[PDB]
Amino acid sequence: AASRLGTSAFSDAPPVELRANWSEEDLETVIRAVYRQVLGNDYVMASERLVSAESLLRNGKITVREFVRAVAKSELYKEKFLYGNFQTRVIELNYKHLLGRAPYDESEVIFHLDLYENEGFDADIDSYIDSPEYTNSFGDWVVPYYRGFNTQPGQKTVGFNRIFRLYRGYANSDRAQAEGSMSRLARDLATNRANTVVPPSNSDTAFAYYTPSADVPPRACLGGSFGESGRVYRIEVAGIRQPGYPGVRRSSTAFLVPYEQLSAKMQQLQRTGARIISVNPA
Amino acid sequence: MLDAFAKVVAQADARGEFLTNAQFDALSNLVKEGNKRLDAVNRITSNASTIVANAARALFAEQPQLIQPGGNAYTNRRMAACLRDMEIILRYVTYAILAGDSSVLDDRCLNGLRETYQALGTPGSSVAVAIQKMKDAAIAIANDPNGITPGDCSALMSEIAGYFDRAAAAVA
Amino acid sequence: MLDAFAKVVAQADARGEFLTNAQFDALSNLVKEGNKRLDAVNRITSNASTIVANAARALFAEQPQLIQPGGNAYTNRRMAACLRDMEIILRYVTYAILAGDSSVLDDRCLNGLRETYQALGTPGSSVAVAIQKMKDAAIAIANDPNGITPGDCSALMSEIAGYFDRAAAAVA
Amino acid sequence: MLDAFAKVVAQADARGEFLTNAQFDALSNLVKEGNKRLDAVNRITSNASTIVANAARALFAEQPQLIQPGGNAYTNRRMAACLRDMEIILRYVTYAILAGDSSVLDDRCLNGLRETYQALGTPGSSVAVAIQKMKDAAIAIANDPNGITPGDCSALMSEIAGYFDRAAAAVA
Amino acid sequence: TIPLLSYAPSSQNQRVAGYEVPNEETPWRYSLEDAVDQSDIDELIWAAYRQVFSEHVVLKSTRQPHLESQLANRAISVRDFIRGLAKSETFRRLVVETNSNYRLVEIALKRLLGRAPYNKQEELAWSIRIATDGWQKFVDTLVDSDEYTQNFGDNTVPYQRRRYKDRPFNLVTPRYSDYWRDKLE
Amino acid sequence: MKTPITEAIAAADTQGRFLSNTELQAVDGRFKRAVASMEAARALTNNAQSLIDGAAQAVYQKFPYTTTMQGSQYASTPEGKAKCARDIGYYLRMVTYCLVAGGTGPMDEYLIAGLSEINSTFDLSPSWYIEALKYIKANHGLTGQAAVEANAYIDYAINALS
Amino acid sequence: MKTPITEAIAAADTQGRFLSNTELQAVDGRFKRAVASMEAARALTNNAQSLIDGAAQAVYQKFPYTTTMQGSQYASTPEGKAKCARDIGYYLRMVTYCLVAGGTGPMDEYLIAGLSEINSTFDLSPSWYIEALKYIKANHGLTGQAAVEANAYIDYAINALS
Amino acid sequence: MKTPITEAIAAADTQGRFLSNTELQAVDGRFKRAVASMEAARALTNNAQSLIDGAAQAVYQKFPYTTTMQGSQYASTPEGKAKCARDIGYYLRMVTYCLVAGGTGPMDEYLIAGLSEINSTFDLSPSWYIEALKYIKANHGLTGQAAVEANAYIDYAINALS
Ligand SMILES: CCC1=C(C)/C(=C/C2=NC(=C\c3[nH]c(/C=C4\NC(=O)[C@H](C)[C@H]4CC)c(C)c3CCC(=O)O)/C(CCC(=O)O)=C2C)NC1=O
Ligand SMILES: CCC1=C(C)/C(=C/C2=NC(=C\c3[nH]c(/C=C4\NC(=O)[C@H](C)[C@H]4CC)c(C)c3CCC(=O)O)/C(CCC(=O)O)=C2C)NC1=O
Ligand SMILES: CCC1=C(C)/C(=C/C2=NC(=C\c3[nH]c(/C=C4\NC(=O)[C@H](C)[C@H]4CC)c(C)c3CCC(=O)O)/C(CCC(=O)O)=C2C)NC1=O
Ligand SMILES: CCC1=C(C)/C(=C/C2=NC(=C\c3[nH]c(/C=C4\NC(=O)[C@H](C)[C@H]4CC)c(C)c3CCC(=O)O)/C(CCC(=O)O)=C2C)NC1=O
Ligand SMILES: CCC1=C(C)/C(=C/C2=NC(=C\c3[nH]c(/C=C4\NC(=O)[C@H](C)[C@H]4CC)c(C)c3CCC(=O)O)/C(CCC(=O)O)=C2C)NC1=O
Ligand SMILES: CCC1=C(C)/C(=C/C2=NC(=C\c3[nH]c(/C=C4\NC(=O)[C@H](C)[C@H]4CC)c(C)c3CCC(=O)O)/C(CCC(=O)O)=C2C)NC1=O
Ligand SMILES: CCC1=C(C)/C(=C/C2=NC(=C\c3[nH]c(/C=C4\NC(=O)[C@H](C)[C@H]4CC)c(C)c3CCC(=O)O)/C(CCC(=O)O)=C2C)NC1=O
Ligand SMILES: CCC1=C(C)/C(=C/C2=NC(=C\c3[nH]c(/C=C4\NC(=O)[C@H](C)[C@H]4CC)c(C)c3CCC(=O)O)/C(CCC(=O)O)=C2C)NC1=O
Ligand SMILES: CCC1=C(C)/C(=C/C2=NC(=C\c3[nH]c(/C=C4\NC(=O)[C@H](C)[C@H]4CC)c(C)c3CCC(=O)O)/C(CCC(=O)O)=C2C)NC1=O
Ligand SMILES: CCC1=C(C)/C(=C/C2=NC(=C\c3[nH]c(/C=C4\NC(=O)[C@H](C)[C@H]4CC)c(C)c3CCC(=O)O)/C(CCC(=O)O)=C2C)NC1=O
Ligand SMILES: CCC1=C(C)/C(=C/C2=NC(=C\c3[nH]c(/C=C4\NC(=O)[C@H](C)[C@H]4CC)c(C)c3CCC(=O)O)/C(CCC(=O)O)=C2C)NC1=O
Ligand SMILES: CCC1=C(C)/C(=C/C2=NC(=C\c3[nH]c(/C=C4\NC(=O)[C@H](C)[C@H]4CC)c(C)c3CCC(=O)O)/C(CCC(=O)O)=C2C)NC1=O
Ligand SMILES: CCC1=C(C)/C(=C/C2=NC(=C\c3[nH]c(/C=C4\NC(=O)[C@H](C)[C@H]4CC)c(C)c3CCC(=O)O)/C(CCC(=O)O)=C2C)NC1=O
């Protein structure tokens, strides 16, 4: 299941280490890929590229690790993400761009935030860059890639869910996303709450399903529900627009429905135009 | 990324069995018309820059509010981004034409584009108009009857239109 | 809703085979000690109110922070809610004792309890302490050797203890 | 909707006096004759569909005006409705048999039944004939004794006939 | 089994359209959609209790503890809460047992659906629904009617649709009519 | 009313079906237990006169203030003592009715319904009735399964008062 | 599943009430009947293969046209004969399940759950299974209380098919 | 009933709007296709007696085994033969109404509605009438549009019965 989830093809690793480290062409590719991963697929204009770093990069004086750090600490990166977002959101973006994953638990935010508060941002990026994870998955000669999709390293299951919150498509950039300018994985991270996977748009209608548990039914039924034979299936929906009496209200929401009624409820929801995000047993 | 052959193989793998005679004939039809496919993609790629440039001039002549101050194709940085995105759509459509399948077009390029533009604020309908300008330009360039050995090509031209249409509809 | 008999039937239906002699023997053992089961249910339900009341007094004596101002069982509305939930757990445990299996207990009062209490702020550990207080009281009243015919009831006592423990483990 | 025990208790509650010895012996007699009541309801419910269908076959021919064009049983839909109502009456009568009193028959049915049919335009007299034909069918099927230890169940047959007569007189 | 025998609808305030701003006689709309604090949720629950059962009969034993907890944790819609009140045993004892199907159609329509019977023919029309499908299924279809979904959406407590210069249903309809008073002295 | 027979009938009426064997089994069990139930009811009603007076004196002893400090809520006057006798007699009569009905139906319809609502308005402390019912449960004079049935209903009332 | 035990539990659950004496009496009746029920179930499963084989031959004799006439619904091929055996085996297995459950719950949940819809879509005739069930009802070889309950459940299935 | 005109009226009434040009176009189509349908109705009424006689003999020949078994649900006796004639006539009589109404309304109002319960209780196999109506379907004597529209209604009824 590749196309719907969004992982079109992320199925190899681009090193630059070679006898021909320049390789006369391959270095161009490596530079592009670093820009795509570190700057979050931002469209960097030609004039503002970090020419000084690339100089040392071909010369061999700096490794790919040093190149990634140079971009990460350069003001090019800072203007896009660091200066303009909530600090916790910046921590999330750092995890996405440098270590190719999402925060697995609240302790990650605790540690990185404390670094930022005392040592400064430069030290925060340093910690990501030289963390054991970066040193192992990548190797100072391998451009960072989104390894969060693969589960081989050893990670909390929630990680998979969480990475799909940050990656909202191949085309998407974190400077320009549906929920941008505010924390995307903050309220959930404190409560260790799982997230339903929101597939990115693909030649069909899209309705980004925000999931604030402030006003939603619980994940479980927490009762007998209607009491009819069979368990209680929780159905989510986003784009409810047709029946606006005061204005529909809470256009994106979930309903806990007993099994026997699901069919009926389904058609009602389809009538309003909302595309059901998920139907999970509760 | 799936191409035509790969698409047939993947369906056959889902159902197990063994490649049926009908599927064999379909692929043989694909290969016997392959020279046409390659010629079309070569023509479109050779004039990529002028296709994008001409379509861009037309778009900004037809919808001036985009380039007026405060619009999304203003400030010379967003203009660069807009030209980039037009060229990228053309590039992935060219990929699709060579492949013979639209899987590549929807798997990377159109995968997430809708929400990207929705968040940016860029008018999706105008982007669709621009893609359609490119559609007419490229199909005319490929269907130019002079310059190559003549022959039937209308099916391939309709296929090119189909790819451009898919992109334009998904953005809008 | 699956009781012991229903559970055996459902497993046998999954396999698609008639009940084995062993399964028949098990259910025959259940029915031959049925009077003990229903006697225990009767004794628990006869003292339900006193069970919940005494256990509540004990819980608030052991953990005064709950009934101090600010604590989650303060303002007399939340106190009513706390007593209600204690008796709800007792009621579903009584259902489970009559049925013979914990399916009802795990489906209708334990399924989502942990998440709801976590979100509410209710201390789950304290709730576990409360249900264990109820466990001791109910076990004692049901196992009282005076007032009814003598016999052996240890298996049933272990089962009721197990169900109380199941609830305590899920809420905390 | 009351039963025999509840009926005597309700009268005693209206009087406000403890159950008299006479009432106790009356209810003891009712329990003494419980097995026959249970047998009768079991036997009638096992053959319910056949009973009603067989009586209906005869009813429509013996009253041809109903099935001639322009009559109340004419058309497929109204014929379905007549069968449905015959079965409804049979169901509520079976309820009454198990109860031991006609309270259920008069509470959720037979309270204005005549008026409902009279407004609908159904001839009440024909409905009475149908109820009486059903009454004969039911008394026969319950009063065909074989396959069980015999007894003088004539009392049960008489009270069942009384229920059917009550319905027939209430609708006409 | 049978397409419910067609009834002829009569002109009524609820059927009519009217471009009126709310009056002081407006029924008042208890909507759980806003997900108000627990204290206001108590009012909403009370109003549903006041509607399905009458103000007169809503005592401690009538109160379902489960329902009180139901509508507090943003659970099954207020509509389903209404249905739970309706099919509860106390309701069946208080209303269903004390009336005939023909009167039951009227009572349930006035309280659950909130509109009076269109005519006597409709009382007849849904009596069979009660009989064949069962009272539980009758109230199921009563609150699953298209009319209901338009009238009270999902999270809106049922109210008398518009008693414009009209006696309120609660104050014109008893728990049971004098016909059953034959069993009383 | 919540009588076993009627409960089975209503369960079948909810599904619009003729009485299935499950309901018939239930009512058969009711008939099989009815012998002990009716003997228990006879025993309680023929000893009722002693029981009612004994319970009245028991509550007078457990709560001496209810016999002395003035107030309509108390039995300080002979009229109040008559009220006390009347109400404890109500409870005893209801228990016998429930014993013969085979379920809690009678006491639920004639006593427990709205009991809390009125015992606070007239300021009759439920604890008084609790103690009286405990006396009746100790001096009922039944034995065996008859006794278990009667005590179950008595304790139902006790838990309802609380 | 509509097991008598679970039915009583659900009836108490919808009212949020502790199990009263009425429910306990019902479950006691269940357990009283269970001794005969289990004896009957053991008897049916001990003769399971013989019973299914005999019923198969019974329908082959009663409807000889089903063993010759062409059509997927007919057993004019070894696979179709296997299907006949499989379905009558389903009916027998459901009967044993209902015997141990003490109610019609299993019969309603795993059978009699759109049996009309399925037989109509396939156009298979109910009469086939009705006659097969009749053979089983006559050849069960039971006597006493066990016999009456088993035949009652078989007849429930028979009348449900119609 | 479910007449095209009536259906448009109902669709407009549930919205509460005056008849828009969409509904008027629909009714115009009904009038335009009401020339052939009325011709077909005239044709089938003028030869109604002969065609019902032919259909009656067709069903007698297709089902002689029902024609010989004695009983209430059979035409073996002369009284049953009279009943069979009248019911075959009923089907033709309803088909003419269906042709004139230009819709399936008459089908649902005078039949179809509750066809299952009737064919279960009286157990009058629909196949009898189905074979007769197929005889009619070929021998009706319509042509072109009249024939195809009549055939559409006839086969709607046939597939609805099954
Ligand atoms: C500290 C700042 C800094 C310096 C000074 C620097 C020097 C520098 N100049 C380079 C290339 C070069 N530099 C020259 C320069 C010249 N060619 C000529 O004919 C002239 C005589 C002369 C200019 C006056 C050329 C030709 C190359 C290309 C070498 C090659 O790729 O073959 C390279 C090779 C890798 C690359 O191009 O990135 C480095 C590292 N890099 C830096 O980051
Ligand atoms: C935009 C910059 C920024 C802010 C503001 C921020 C807030 C923030 N404050 C936190 C902790 C906290 N913040 C407080 C704050 C307070 N407790 C009190 O009693 C007072 C009323 C109040 C201070 C006056 C507390 C108690 C915690 C610890 C919470 C815990 O460990 O559970 C945490 C939890 C993670 C951690 O402790 O590392 C975050 C994310 N994070 C940020 O990146
Ligand atoms: C390879 C597949 C792919 C696509 C398609 C893609 C789209 C894409 N276009 C963008 C920007 C943009 N896209 C436009 C597009 C337009 N503005 C207009 O007026 C026109 C109507 C239209 C061109 C036809 C503009 C103006 C921006 C820049 C907005 C900004 O950065 O402020 C951005 C992010 C902001 C940035 O440029 O940094 C993305 C991610 N990204 C991808 O990875
Ligand atoms: C009482 C609290 C409350 C709020 C806040 C509310 C918002 C709200 N506004 C809506 C519609 C809408 N709201 C807008 C608003 C805007 N359109 C624009 O172009 C602007 C950028 C923006 C205003 C400046 C639009 C266009 C729709 C219709 C969307 C559609 O039909 O697709 C909808 C969708 C369903 C409907 O139309 O009824 C909701 C739920 N509803 C509420 O009951
Ligand atoms: C580098 C790899 C490679 C490519 C790209 C390639 C293309 C290629 N396609 C061909 C055929 C063709 N070229 C056309 C071209 C057309 N006829 C028309 O009327 C249209 C205007 C137009 C469609 C764009 C057609 C129809 C054929 C097929 C007939 C044949 O194979 O000779 C031919 C032979 C004759 C010719 O040049 O057209 C070549 C060499 N061969 C290769 O080895
Ligand atoms: C109203 C519904 C109803 C009840 C309540 C009921 C009770 C009941 N329990 C019984 C047995 C019994 N009850 C026990 C009970 C116990 N043994 C112990 O060590 C424990 C202290 C205790 C568990 C609470 C035992 C051992 C028997 C005899 C064996 C048996 O049949 O289970 C018996 C048979 C022997 C006797 O008369 O005592 C009956 C009739 N029957 C009913 O129809
Ligand atoms: C409380 C128990 C109860 C009863 C009694 C009941 C009867 C009942 N039968 C009805 C219809 C009917 N009842 C019949 C019955 C008959 N047709 C005949 O030819 C005979 C004369 C007679 C049987 C002997 C018919 C034909 C109709 C349909 C009338 C019509 O649509 O024109 C109607 C009209 C409304 C409707 O169809 O829903 C009611 C209320 N419904 C109930 O819930
Ligand atoms: C206007 C629409 C309409 C239809 C269609 C209709 C059908 C209809 N057919 C019936 C019976 C019947 N149908 C038959 C028919 C046949 N016997 C055979 O051997 C043949 C194979 C077959 C002819 C195809 C017979 C014999 C009866 C009488 C059965 C009885 O009264 O028990 C009956 C029962 C009452 C009666 O005899 O009239 C109805 C209601 N009624 C209607 O109002
Ligand atoms: C699950 C519901 C249920 C049923 C069906 C049931 C039947 C039942 N009927 C019985 C006997 C009997 N049934 C009758 C009844 C009759 N006398 C007659 O003349 C009539 C033909 C018939 C009335 C319909 C008699 C006389 C006996 C034997 C003596 C007795 O048990 O009272 C018996 C006792 C001996 C036996 O098993 O045969 C049972 C258990 N018991 C039940 O719990
Ligand atoms: C499926 C059956 C079921 C259960 C089990 C259940 C639990 C439950 N208990 C609740 C409340 C509560 N529960 C407590 C419980 C306690 N406070 C304490 O100090 C004690 C340790 C403890 C009692 C043992 C409190 C204080 C509340 C009130 C919270 C609030 O609404 O503000 C709530 C919040 C909404 C409500 O009150 O209904 C739920 C959902 N709800 C259900 O529907
Ligand atoms: C808001 C306006 C309003 C009024 C006036 C009203 C009256 C009213 N009182 C009722 C009951 C009742 N009313 C009484 C009243 C009395 N019993 C006595 O002994 C006294 C003489 C008298 C008190 C002074 C009683 C006993 C009942 C219950 C009757 C029963 O259920 O049997 C009922 C029956 C339906 C129900 O219980 O909801 C209504 C409608 N209802 C209303 O909504
Ligand atoms: C059949 C169901 C039923 C019950 C239960 C019932 C109880 C009942 N008891 C009452 C009062 C009373 N009940 C008592 C009884 C007692 N005094 C004592 O010292 C003892 C502790 C206690 C006996 C155990 C007294 C003194 C009053 C009068 C309260 C007053 O006037 O303030 C009243 C108020 C009217 C009155 O004064 O009589 C009611 C309605 N009525 C009923 O219809
Ligand atoms: C446990 C619940 C359950 C039931 C009741 C059940 C019955 C059942 N029998 C079936 C078929 C079948 N059953 C038979 C059996 C027979 N051949 C004969 O000659 C006899 C007359 C008859 C035995 C009485 C045949 C031949 C088919 C296949 C019919 C077809 O493919 O159209 C089918 C269709 C799907 C299939 O091919 O199996 C079902 C669903 N399956 C179930 O899971």
- Structure-token pair, residue F7: 């409960």
Longest Cα pair distance anywhere in chain C, in angstroms?
A: 61
- Cα D127 to middle of ligand 8, angstroms: 21
Are A43 and B81 an interchain contact pair (Cβ–Cβ within 8 Å)?
A: yes
Burial of C152 (0-12, 13-18, 19+ CB in 10 A): exposed
> Shortest CA distance to H102 belongs to which of H45, H47, H43, H150?
H150
CATH label of the domain that carries residue F50: 1.10.490.20
Identify the experimental approach.
cryo-EM
From residue F63, how far is each of A168, C33, F119, F139 by CA, in Å? 74, 44, 17, 19
**Alpha-carbon gap, residue C127 to C116, rounded angstroms:** 13
CB D84: neighbour CB atoms within 10 A?
17
Question: DSSP state, C66?
Answer: G
**Alpha-carbon gap, residue A213 to A118, rounded angstroms:** 33
Minimal C-alpha gap between G108 and chain C (Å): 13
Look at residue E31 and give its three-state secondary structure: strand
**Alpha-carbon gap, residue B104 to B98, rounded angstroms:** 10
Are A3 and B119 an interchain contact pair (Cβ–Cβ within 8 Å)?
A: no
Atom 1 in ligand 6: which residue has the minimum CA distance?
A: G25
Are E100 and D108 an interchain contact pair (Cβ–Cβ within 8 Å)?
A: yes
**Alpha-carbon gap, residue F162 to C48, rounded angstroms:** 10
Residue ranges of alpha helices (H) inside chain H are 4-15, 21-46, 48-62, 64-68, 78-101, 105-110, 115-121, 126-139, 144-161
Question: DSSP state, C125?
Answer: H
**Alpha-carbon gap, residue C115 to F116, rounded angstroms:** 34
Look at residue E156 and give its three-state secondary structure: strand
F84 annotated to a ligand binding site: yes
* CA-CA-CA-CA torsion sign (F133, F134, F137, F141): negative
Burial of D73 (0-12, 13-18, 19+ CB in 10 A): buried
**Alpha-carbon gap, residue C131 to C125, rounded angstroms:** 10
Question: DSSP state, E93?
Answer: I
- Cα B32 to middle of ligand 5, angstroms: 11
If one counts the domains in chain B, the total is 1
The CA-to-CA distance between both ends of chain G, in Å, stands at 22
Q: Which residue of C has its CA nearest to G100?
A: C5
Q: Which chains does E contact via 3+ CB–CB distances below 8 A? A: A, C, D, F, G, H
CA torsion, ordered H55, H58, H59, H65, to nearest 10 deg: 160
CB H156: neighbour CB atoms within 10 A?
14
Residues of B in contact with A9 (CB under 8 A): 1, 107-108
Amino acid at residue number H161 = L
CA H110-H112-H113 angle, to 5 degrees, is 80
CA H28-H29-H30 angle, to 5 degrees, is 90
User: Length of chain H, please?
Assistant: 162
Tell me which of A229, A231, A259, A260 to substitute to probe the interface with G (most G C-beta atoms closer than 10 Å). A229
Find where tokens 């003999």 sit. Answer: H57
3-state SS string over F85-149? HHHHHHHHHHHHHHHHHCCCHHHHHHHHCCHHHHHHHCCCCHHHHHHHHHHHHHHCCCCHHHHHH
Host H or E run for residue E97: none
Angle, to 10 degrees, between the axis of helix G21-46 and the axis of helix G48-62?
80
Answer for the pair A237, A275: CB distance below 8 angstroms, yes or no.
yes
Burial of A265 (0-12, 13-18, 19+ CB in 10 A): middle
**Alpha-carbon gap, residue H13 to D144, rounded angstroms:** 58
If one counts the domains in chain F, the total is 1
- Cα A271 to middle of ligand 4, angstroms: 18
Answer for the pair G106, G94: CB distance below 8 angstroms, yes or no.
yes
**Alpha-carbon gap, residue G81 to G88, rounded angstroms:** 11
> Shortest CA distance to A177 belongs to which of A157, A134, A206?
A206
Amino acid at residue number G41 = A
How many Cα atoms sit within 13 Å of B82 on the Cβ side?
27
**Alpha-carbon gap, residue B68 to F71, rounded angstroms:** 90
Query: Ligand 8, from D72, D76, D83, D84: best to mutate by most atoms within 8 Å of Cβ?
Result: D76
Look at residue E59 and give its three-state secondary structure: coil
From residue C59, how far is each of C92, C126, C134, D165, E145 by CA, in Å? 20, 8, 10, 64, 49
The number of angstroms, rounded, from the C-alpha of D40 to the middle of its chain's C-alpha atoms is: 13
Question: DSSP state, D47?
Answer: T
Tell whether ligand 7 has an atom less than 6 A from the beta carbon of residue D126. Answer: yes
Beta bridge partners of A257: A233
Pairing of strands A279-281, A253-258: unpaired
Burial of B55 (0-12, 13-18, 19+ CB in 10 A): buried
| Cross-sheet strand order for the sheet of A232-237 | A253-258, A232-237, A279-281
Residues 6+ apart with CB under 8 A from A107: none
The number of angstroms, rounded, from the C-alpha of G73 to the middle of its chain's C-alpha atoms is: 22
Q: A41 φ, ψ to 5°? A: 60, 30
User: Length of chain A, please?
Assistant: 282
Host H or E run for residue E3: none
> Shortest CA distance to G95 belongs to which of C5, F25, C18, C31?
C18
CA A168-A143-A147 angle, to 5 degrees, is 45
Amino acid at residue number E182 = D
Atom 5 in ligand 5: which residue has the minimum CA distance?
A: B38
Are A202 and B108 an interchain contact pair (Cβ–Cβ within 8 Å)?
A: no
CATH label of the domain that carries residue C160: 1.10.490.20
Find where tokens 């089903």 sit. Answer: G66
**Alpha-carbon gap, residue E116 to E138, rounded angstroms:** 16
- Structure-token pair, residue A222: 């927490």
Answer for the pair G103, G10: CB distance below 8 angstroms, yes or no.
no
Please provide the DSSP assignment of F5-68 as one string.
HHHHHHHHHHTT----HHHHHHHHHHHHHHHHHHHHHHHHHHTHHHHHHHHHHHHHHH-THHHH
**Alpha-carbon gap, residue C142 to C160, rounded angstroms:** 10
> Shortest CA distance to B3 belongs to which of B99, B71, B122?
B99
3-state SS string over chain A? CCCCCCCCCCCCCCECCCCCCCCCCHHHHHHHHHHHHHCCCCCCCHHHCCHHHHHHHHHCCCCHHHHHHHHHHCHHHHHHHHCCCCHHHHHHHHHHHHCCCCCCCHHHHHHHHHHHHHCCHHHHHHHHHHCHHHHHHCCCCECCCCCCCCCCCCCCCHHHHHHHHHCCCCCCECCECCCCCCCCCCHHHHHCCCCCCCCCCCCCCCCCCCCCHHHCCCCCCCCCCCCCCCCEEEEEECCCCCCCCCCCCCCCEEEEEEHHHHHHHHHHHHHHCCCCCCEEEC
Find where tokens 């350069």 sit. Answer: A74
User: Length of chain B, please?
Assistant: 172
Host H or E run for residue F161: helix F144-161
**Alpha-carbon gap, residue B27 to C80, rounded angstroms:** 74
Answer for the pair E35, E154: CB distance below 8 angstroms, yes or no.
no
Percentages helix, strand, coil for chain G (3-state, rounded to 5) are 75, 0, 25
Find where tokens 């002395």 sit. Answer: F68
- Structure-token pair, residue A246: 């005061």
**Alpha-carbon gap, residue G100 to C24, rounded angstroms:** 8
Please provide the DSSP assignment of G56-102 as one string.
HHHHHHH-GGGGTS-STTS--SHHHHHHHHHHHHHHHHHHHHHHHHT
CA torsion, ordered D50, D53, D58, D60, to nearest 10 deg: 180
Q: Is H117 on the interface with E (CB under 8 A)?
A: yes
Q: Which chains does C contact via 3+ CB–CB distances below 8 A? A: A, E, F, G
Residues of E in contact with A224 (CB under 8 A): 66
Question: Which range marks the domain in which residue H140 is found?
Answer: 1-162
**Alpha-carbon gap, residue D169 to D163, rounded angstroms:** 10
Question: Which range marks the domain in which residue B68 is found?
Answer: 1-172
From residue C171, how far is each of A199, C59, C158, F49 by CA, in Å? 34, 16, 20, 51
Q: A59 φ, ψ to 5°? A: -60, -20
> Shortest CA distance to E48 belongs to which of E23, E71, E14?
E71
